[PDB]
Amino acid sequence: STTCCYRFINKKIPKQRLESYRRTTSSHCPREAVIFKTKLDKELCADPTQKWVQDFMKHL
Amino acid sequence: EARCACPARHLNNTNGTVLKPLGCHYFCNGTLCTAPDGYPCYNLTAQQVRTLTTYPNTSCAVGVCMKGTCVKNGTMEQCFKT
């Protein structure tokens, strides 16, 4: 609930590089964000206003 | 940059405004990151940080990050930790 993203992963990350983790940050965060996890177990901040994401979340 | 694309805990408030971090620095991976310039923030005194709790108990200075400093803008909020 209070976890927020300061900055986003700009370039698309291939689906083969991401795990199944998905969490949407609070609507009260300065920046609207969805959180994914790489297969290296790193949490990464993503802009839901990027069609690269809307595609991935649909895929999940 | 990409390295600092990681989430961190923000503080909450009873004012109905956006959540905001303590200062403009945060820890991701093996990088101590700096919030982007323009990013909103809370600038609390050493004393205010010492007594920071799960309920509002001091007026919290709202600010804007600029090169790692939370520059106070004048607005005060009832911030708290969750």
Residue numbers in the entry:
A (entry chain B): 8 to 67
B (entry chain A): 21 to 102
Question: What did the article's authors report about this structure?
Answer:
To achieve this, we mutated residues Tyr44 and Leu39 in the CC + 1 binding pocket to Ala and Pro, respectively; Pro was chosen as it occurs in the corresponding position to Leu39 in several class A3 evasins. We found that the Y44A and L39P mutants exhibited increased affinity to most chemokines with aromatic CC + 1 residues but decreased affinity to most chemokines with aliphatic CC + 1 residues. In the case of L39P, the affinity decreases were only small so this mutant bound to 21 of the 24 available CC chemokines with affinities tighter than 100 nM, compared to 17 chemokines for wild type EVA-A. Consistent with their increased affinity for chemokines with aromatic CC + 1 residues, both the Y44A and L39P mutants exhibited substantial enhancements in their potencies for inhibition of both CCL2 and CCL7. To validate the structural basis of enhanced binding and inhibition of chemokines with aromatic CC + 1 residues, we determined the structures of EVA-A(Y44A) in complex with CCL2 and both mutants in complex with CCL7. Thus, the increased breadth of chemokine binding by EVA-A(L39P) resulted, at least in part, from the removal of negative selection. The detailed structure of the hydrophobic pocket may enable a class A3 evasin to exhibit preferences for chemokines with different CC + 1 residues, as observed for wild type EVA-A. Alternatively, the pocket may accommodate a relatively wide variety of CC + 1 residues, as observed here for the EVA-A(L39P) mutant. It is noteworthy that five of the 14 identified class A3 evasins have proline at the equivalent position of Leu39 in EVA-A, so the wild type forms of these evasins may recognise a fairly broad spectrum of CC chemokines. Indeed, incorporation of such elements into EVA-A(L39P) may facilitate tailoring of its selectivity to different subsets of CC chemokines, as needed in different therapeutic contexts.
Evasins are chemokine-binding proteins from tick saliva, whose application as anti-inflammatory therapeutics will require manipulation of their chemokine target selectivity. Here we describe subclass A3 evasins, which are unique to the tick genus Amblyomma and distinguished from “classical” class A1 evasins by an additional disulfide bond near the chemokine recognition interface. The A3 evasin EVA-AAM1001 (EVA-A) bound to CC chemokines and inhibited their receptor activation. Structures of chemokine-bound EVA-A revealed a deep hydrophobic pocket, unique to A3 evasins, that interacts with the residue immediately following the CC motif of the chemokine.
